[PDB]
């Protein structure tokens, strides 16, 4: 029942999952449909195909609240990072600008130990 003409889309793309939420310019969530919401479970969530179905289920549910143009903030070292920007385009959204806001610490907190796999 809302109507905001311009929005912002946040894509967090990790090594296990992708999550595409779409907000207003103040930072209030309209729709958030991710790769587990679209039916997947396990290691399938990290594939590029599950990213281009997560970005569609957030795009055509943001349009029911009237969102016609989003900005794109991607972050994360994931596979599904270009296939979720190209998937917002072929669902009826103008993308405008694309920015990278990956949280880069200035050698602060200590990382977990490396895996002996």
């Amino acid at each position: 029942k809302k109507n905001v003409p311009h929005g912002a889309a946040h894509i967090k793309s990790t090594f296990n999952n992708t999550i595409v939420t779409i907000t207003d310019p103040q930072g209030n969530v309209i729709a958030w449909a991710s790769s587990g919401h679209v039916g997947f479970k396990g290691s399938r969530k990290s594939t590029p195909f599950a990213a281009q179905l997560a970005a569609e289920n957030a795009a055509r549910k943001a349009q029911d609240h009237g969102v016609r143009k989003v900005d794109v903030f991607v972050k994360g070292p994931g596979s599904g990072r270009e296939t979720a920007i190209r998937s917002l385009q072929a669902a009826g959204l103008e993308v405008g600008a694309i920015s990278d806001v990956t949280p880069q610490p200035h050698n602060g907190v200590r990382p977990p130990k490396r895996r002996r796999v």
């Binding site: 997947f40 399938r44 594939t47 195909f49 599950a50």
Partner: protein
């Protein structure tokens, strides 16, 4: 094999029905070298197909094959600790091969009495999209369209 592709064999037109598609059908029915027997099965079935449609039966047979050609098969691969199928696009000469194997392959276990009328009814149902050979056209497609996520494993 290791050293490049192998040559494929040419097929001569069938003398009764002027079609390469019919002489490729009689080779799938062929068992134990009995080729005159395998020609009486295929000729006897296509003449039982114009006793129920009236149209020339190589028009029925080309419509029967266009409903059992797959376009995405399901070739397998083991990646790590788990193995899972990978969908690949079928090149056009395999599509006719895999379709004619399915007509002859499912007509050997239908419930009629002779191989002539079993092969005849499978061509008529596949031309209408009814038989069991059409069911493996979409069971191939359902398994290929439930593994879209694995399409980056193209070897």
């Amino acid at each position: 094999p290791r050293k490049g592709p192998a040559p494929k064999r040419p097929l001569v037109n069938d003398p009764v029905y002027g079609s390469q598609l019919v002489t490729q059908l009689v080779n799938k029915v062929l068992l134990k070298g009995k080729k005159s027997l395998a020609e009486r099965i295929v000729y006897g079935a296509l003449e039982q197909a114009r006793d129920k449609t009236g149209t020339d039966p190589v028009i029925t047979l080309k419509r029967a094959l266009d409903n059992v050609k797959p376009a995405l098969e399901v070739r397998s691969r083991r990646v790590g600790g788990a193995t899972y199928q990978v969908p690949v696009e079928v090149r056009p000469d395999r599509s006719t091969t895999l379709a004619l194997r399915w007509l002859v392959g499912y007509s050997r276990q239908r419930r009629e009495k002779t191989m002539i009328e079993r092969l005849a009814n499978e061509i008529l149902d596949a031309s209408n999209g009814l038989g069991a050979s059409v069911k493996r056209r979409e069971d191939t497609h359902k398994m290929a369209e439930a593994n879209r996520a694995f399409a980056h494993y193209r070897w």
